[PDB]
Symmetry: D2
Subunit: 233 residues, 4 copies
Amino acid sequence: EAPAAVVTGAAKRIGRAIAVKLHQTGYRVVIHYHNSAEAAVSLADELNKERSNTAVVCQADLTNSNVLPASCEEIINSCFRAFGRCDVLVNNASAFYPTPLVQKTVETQVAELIGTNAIAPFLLTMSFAQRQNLSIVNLCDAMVDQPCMAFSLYNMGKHALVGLTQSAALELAPYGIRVNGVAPGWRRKVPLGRREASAEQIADAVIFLVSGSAQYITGSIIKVDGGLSLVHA
Amino acid sequence: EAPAAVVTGAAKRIGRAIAVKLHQTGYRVVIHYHNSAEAAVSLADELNKERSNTAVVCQADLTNSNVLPASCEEIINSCFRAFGRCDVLVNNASAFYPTPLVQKTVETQVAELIGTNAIAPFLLTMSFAQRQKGTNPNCTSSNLSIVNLCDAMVDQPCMAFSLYNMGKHALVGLTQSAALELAPYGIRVNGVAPGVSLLPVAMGEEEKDKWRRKVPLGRREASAEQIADAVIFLVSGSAQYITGSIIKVDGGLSLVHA
Amino acid sequence: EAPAAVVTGAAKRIGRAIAVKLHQTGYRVVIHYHNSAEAAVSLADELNKERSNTAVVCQADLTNSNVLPASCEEIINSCFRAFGRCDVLVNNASAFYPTPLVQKTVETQVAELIGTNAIAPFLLTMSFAQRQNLSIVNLCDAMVDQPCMAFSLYNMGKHALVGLTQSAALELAPYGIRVNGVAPGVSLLPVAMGEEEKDKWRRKVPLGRREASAEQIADAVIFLVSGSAQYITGSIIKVDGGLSLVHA
Amino acid sequence: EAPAAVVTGAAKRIGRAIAVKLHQTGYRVVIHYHNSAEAAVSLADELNKERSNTAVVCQADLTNSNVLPASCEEIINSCFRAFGRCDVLVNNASAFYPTPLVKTVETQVAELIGTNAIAPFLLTMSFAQRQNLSIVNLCDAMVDQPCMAFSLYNMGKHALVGLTQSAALELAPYGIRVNGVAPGVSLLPVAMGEEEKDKWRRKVPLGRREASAEQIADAVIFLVSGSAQYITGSIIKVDGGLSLVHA
Ligand SMILES: NC(=O)c1ccc[n+]([C@@H]2O[C@H](COP(=O)([O-])OP(=O)(O)OC[C@H]3O[C@@H](n4cnc5c(N)ncnc54)[C@H](OP(=O)(O)O)[C@@H]3O)[C@@H](O)[C@H]2O)c1
Ligand SMILES: NC(=O)c1ccc[n+]([C@@H]2O[C@H](COP(=O)([O-])OP(=O)(O)OC[C@H]3O[C@@H](n4cnc5c(N)ncnc54)[C@H](OP(=O)(O)O)[C@@H]3O)[C@@H](O)[C@H]2O)c1
Ligand SMILES: NC(=O)c1ccc[n+]([C@@H]2O[C@H](COP(=O)([O-])OP(=O)(O)OC[C@H]3O[C@@H](n4cnc5c(N)ncnc54)[C@H](OP(=O)(O)O)[C@@H]3O)[C@@H](O)[C@H]2O)c1
Ligand SMILES: NC(=O)c1ccc[n+]([C@@H]2O[C@H](COP(=O)([O-])OP(=O)(O)OC[C@H]3O[C@@H](n4cnc5c(N)ncnc54)[C@H](OP(=O)(O)O)[C@@H]3O)[C@@H](O)[C@H]2O)c1
Ligand SMILES: COC(=O)C1CCN(C(=O)c2ccc(N(C)Cc3cnc4nc(N)nc(N)c4n3)cc2)CC1
Ligand SMILES: COC(=O)C1CCN(C(=O)c2ccc(N(C)Cc3cnc4nc(N)nc(N)c4n3)cc2)CC1
Ligand SMILES: COC(=O)C1CCN(C(=O)c2ccc(N(C)Cc3cnc4nc(N)nc(N)c4n3)cc2)CC1
């Protein structure tokens, strides 16, 4: 039977490119969305036209709250209901905006930036593991140690996601679940800037990590940034 | 006039050693505590007996909630109310317990582990920096800094401690992000990262010795004073160009392979 | 035509598996060796039996010395002589043994451990770049920051190789050359190591309690040289089963 | 009795400030130098005027070669001959210049890798064999965002991080701590135009200035002190936040 994958924030941009490549590789896909229902269904339509009944959508707000654990349980359950299995979880959904230290309430910003970027991946990881070539791929940040000015909460959530990638790789290794990261990265600064950055390049690294060609790789974060993290101020 | 410091979780153990050494160095100190009221008051009493009116206590829960920003503002405000200034913030308080991925509510665990280790340090950092805006300038003798208590083992985490390790990773992120953003205000932001220091009071001696035997330098845990020494260096004039640095105080533990 | 690759220390073990997988992917290969002449020639024979004129051997000592630049130049020149091009360089050859701080001359140990692990990759990188989907892959070590006791010079060499990987990625990007690393943890154990000691190392690995096969290491090299990694440069991929994440 | 320290490349700039601060803390010092004899002797004379018989000089080339192990043994021996003990070794001497990928290259290898990595290793060996003991290595906070065309220098500083960690592990049972101090931008070249110096200064978040040599020395003094007794294998950045700044 065909393996199945959940991709969060899959309606647009990087998540969409990842869902497309997984589907092209032979996966059935759950396309998670929060607000982008039209785009999520448009993508499912396109994938189902290629292979009938191989793409479904799942709505969830990934902001931290009292109901986030049940929402994340539901996303994983939707994979099992549609496809009878869940082989791959891609934690792609992300919020991104500045939160200056010196001057939405700040606690709403915490619930969004830390909740979407770190807590929902944690809850999804728990639900994926509890329900069990299995693997999880977290979308990290190549610039995590040279943060953007005034992005403290965003940077904290991306740091927490490194910690989850490493902790979950160690704890889920006995279950045969690998846990890795892809870290995307102005153009004139990128060493490989002759090539334009694309969502498909990020998806290519995800496809490698979920493949049999990465069966010994766990706890690894692959930077896909054209060399930008190497460039000094 | 003597400078003033806030130390979170300062009633006992490492936070107390930090408060004691700051006080011996000449600081007035706010001893924040959550549940350890008797121990906090006992410490404040000892410090005030050494020099009158140089220590106060401040009670707060640092679990995340919609009131946490007000709590953290109030901790900083307590320093200014007692002492008229706040030169140093030490983010020491920390919840620590396992949260296995495979089997309190999990949302309570998130609020405790991520709140104490990361969100409260972030809000305290916001409040510390914001309160400096009103102060008179001291362009000649000002030495403002924040020290976060990190973990030397953050990249070799303990089994089944994902939320704890996520919170400590976020604290590294805060340390570096706040160092960049607050440098223009002359506020330095650094970390001290213990490996094995004081073992839990409830841990059996056999288990404590298992941890001690891992440490290359002396096969023993760091004393609380050894952790405090690195905090004292980072707040001192001898560290005036250091910002965004995390000093491991771990006896070589993080260098040891499986 | 078919692209061409140099793999150093390719007669046996991980370098052999890399040369084989590059050849299976469509590369012509230079099999570099130092002492393993019979194994190198046998491998070239096997690869040429599959596709004629797609494999050659090249012999060189990669110990540092005043002739090392000439040797490294000649390895790259051997790829151009055989195949007319050189698209990929894999720096795999490596000396590995203890050099305790407290008690071969020590200068010979320096020349061997720092030469093979760092200086030869640097000179090979210079000659590869000068002679021009181009890329270099360096075989690093996932344990570089939790080093084996009494392996100072080896560990220094591997740290220097990380610096080279990053510095050359930065400097050679304008020429379209990507430079990345693959960092094994425990892969193929030494032939001379007893079974009990091998099992000790295997038991450390979270993912499967086993060493990486040479083929698993080669799979990461194949990815990095591929069109699916064209925006990756300066990255070191650990292939370690989670070993580097395990505390004391 | 007073402890003793060897500082390499101690005639000028950061090494000089280290040697002065160690001497002010109460150490007797061996001032190693390569070409700067007049400045090394001037420093020793200044320190001996302050307290008699507390400073000597030791000349050596720290380029890698057949004779480097004997040179490094002789530097450590000079401390024992003058002062009867050697408590601290500071590996500060360093060659620094570009080596573009696209002097012979093997001379550049010998100089850049010898001064930054091989000589620290051999000095570490001789220091340990001869035994609050500690070694401090002068690292580089920018080691993972290197300057364009400085591959050999960067390789040498990466190797020095590996030495700092390997030696901390191996020498811990002997009670010898091994740590690093990693400057970002500190003293710029005297000949560098102020317009270029200002380009570097403006990069630094904390004060838009370079570190003084004395600020680097303050971190060394901490690491050799009793206040760092449990610290080994640590590298302390003294960089004003520079390493945290993205391109
Ligand atoms: N773009 C880059 O260059 C870059 C750089 C570094 C890292 N990354 C990482 O790569 C991943 C994808 O990047 P991207 O630019 O494609 O992401 P993006 O478009 O900024 O957002 C990704 C998706 O996350 C979902 N999302 C946002 N807030 C949410 C919430 N509160 N609850 C539920 N879903 C929410 C959105 O889904 P709906 O639209 O359905 O609401 C959105 O489509 C992210 O993890 C990002 O951090 C990207
Ligand atoms: N001990 C070690 O070996 C070690 C190792 C690595 C890192 N560290 C770090 O070093 C620091 C000091 O360690 P430690 O062992 O001394 O810490 P600890 O005893 O475990 O905790 C310090 C204090 O944290 C306060 N705290 C806990 N939950 C709280 C909450 N919800 N609200 C407010 N305060 C709360 C407690 O205050 P009350 O007692 O008043 O309730 C407690 O006394 C911590 O950040 C720790 O993570 C320590
Ligand atoms: N095996 C592991 O578990 C492991 C772990 C971490 C990293 N690695 C890295 O992965 C790579 C492959 O490892 P491996 O175990 O397959 O390597 P290996 O068998 O120890 O050595 C590979 C080859 O290096 C060549 N070599 C040694 N000294 C040389 C010299 N002076 N001049 C020229 N060539 C020389 C030898 O060639 P001849 O046989 O032709 O003389 C040898 O066959 C190495 O870079 C290694 O550091 C391996
Ligand atoms: N300056 C900075 O901004 C900066 C930044 C990052 C890291 N660092 C590190 O901090 C340390 C001190 O920096 P610095 O700028 O003061 O260094 P420096 O002036 O460039 O060099 C220090 C001394 O190294 C000695 N040296 C050079 N080549 C030598 C050789 N072949 N043999 C023996 N000694 C040799 C020279 O001694 P003689 O003059 O006696 O010949 C020189 O005075 C160095 O390790 C450096 O890499 C400095
Ligand atoms: C249900 O509760 C449990 O299961 C306990 C048993 C498992 N624990 C440890 O393995 C463990 C591992 C390392 C430790 N330390 C090196 C000491 C220690 C002691 N107190 C601490 N307190 C805080 N806040 N943070 C720390 N990192 C910390 N660390 C301590 C305990 C502690 C929690
Ligand atoms: C002359 O004496 C020797 O060669 C020593 C090297 C092997 N020893 C090990 O403890 C040891 C530790 C870890 C090992 N591995 C994880 C396997 C391994 C096997 N071959 C290798 N080859 C190279 N080049 N580099 C490596 N990192 C490497 N690694 C192997 C041996 C002790 C004996
Ligand atoms: C052809 O020769 C050249 O092109 C020279 C001019 C180019 N250089 C610099 O731009 C440069 C960049 C940064 C610098 N610093 C941050 C100051 C500095 C000054 N002296 C040093 N000395 C050593 N040993 N190590 C250092 N890192 C060091 N660093 C200094 C010069 C140095 C070599």
